């Protein structure tokens, strides 16, 4: 068959997308992400174990993640092998899954952040973002040095910081759309035919110019923009 590294990567993305509307699932997911985050990815035996420890969580979303029709190795041997989680995965090794868990843990905390937190994320450069995330403990996650070996900082790659900003962009845009009484300006952003046009309309609505590098109109923002513009 194949190792489950990418499937866990995709399951993490899918559960987080669903956690935006199930507060009880978000608190479940936060605990799982917190456990992965405090496990050293350089210890493959501990890393496989902490993932297998949450089978009850994985089975509620995808029972294929933890399945293994024994008949070959036993299930215990399988769960401790590269056949379950390949520590030498060229793309989704334990470091990459550890970094993705932290990036998801931040995005999870951003779903409850106020407007100022979202703006600071978009204004700060990658280096400031890490120190800023290392200053909001444990709102956006425990990125102290006790849990990360480390300190993070590290686990938040530059590409991870960019995806965190993309999430804060959508969260902030939805807030501005749900707040502004400037109907014509909301029409302008809805009808922007280019990024520079979207930039000028979004900046006027309150989106910081420092976040223009990640500015992009997603489906959920256009949908919310369409409703609000037609809302009388």
Author numbering: 8 to 78, 82 to 242
From the paper:
To test the possibility that deletion of the β-hairpin leads to global structural changes in RidL, we solved the structure of the N-terminal RidL fragment lacking the β-hairpin at 2.1 Å resolution. The N-terminal domain devoid of the β-hairpin crystallized in space group P212121 with two polypeptide chains (called molecule A and B) in the asymmetric unit. These molecules exhibited a root mean square deviation (RMSD) of 0.756 Å over 205 residues among each other, and mainly differ at the F-loop, which was partially undefined due to the high flexibility in molecule A. Superpositions of the Δβ-hairpin mutant with the wild-type RidL domain over the same 205 residues resulted in RMSD of 0.872 Å and 0.962 Å for molecules A and B, respectively. Thus, the N-terminal RidL fragment lacking the β-hairpin adopts an overall structure that is very similar to the parental fragment. Interestingly, the fragment lacking the β-hairpin no longer co-localized with the retromer and was found throughout the cell. As expected, the Δβ-hairpin mutant did not reveal any detectable binding to Vps29. The SEC analysis of RidL-ΔF-loop or RidL-Δβ-hairpin deletion proteins did not reveal any changes in the elution behavior compared to RidL, indicating that the mutants are correctly folded. In contrast, the addition of RidL10–258-Δβ-hairpin or buffer only did not result in the elution of the retromer. Thus, RidL10–258 displaces the retromer from TBC1D5 in a β-hairpin-dependent manner.
